[PDB]
């Protein structure tokens, strides 16, 4: 369902790690960067900037024990940590 999502609104350290990894990979594959490259050449550092600015174009499918799932977007998730 769209609403009634029972999982946390915060981004977990595992979600953050994979988001940065997969985005950094795309960057290293010469994908378009959605933030200004302020002297940044390191895919990971670049990805972290996008994370801070919530520019990372991804959605986390959180699978629940019974096979069902809740889709949360990067923008929705609270990148605290």
């Amino acid at each position: 369902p769209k609403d009634q999502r029972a999982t946390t609104p915060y981004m977990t350290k595992y979600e953050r790690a994979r988001i940065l990894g997969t985005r950094a990979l795309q960057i290293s594959m010469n994908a378009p960067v959605f933030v200004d490259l302020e002297g940044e050449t390191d895919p990971l550092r670049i990805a972290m900037k996008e994370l801070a600015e919530k520019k990372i174009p991804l959605v986390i499918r959180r699978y629940l024990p019974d096979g069902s799932f809740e889709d949360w977007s990067v923008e929705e998730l609270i990148v605290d940590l």
């Binding site: 795309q26 594959m29 010469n30 378009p32 960067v33 959605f34 174009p57 959605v59």
Partner: peptide, 26 residues
């Protein structure tokens, strides 16, 4: 959004599957 760099030309024609790594750099 206005960031045209976020939109894939092939995706416009349904040539890109945003939820598949087979498409790649979405």
């Amino acid at each position: 959004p206005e960031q045209k760099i976020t939109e894939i030309e092939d995706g416009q024609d349904g040539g890109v599957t945003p939820y598949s790594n087979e498409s790649g750099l979405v």
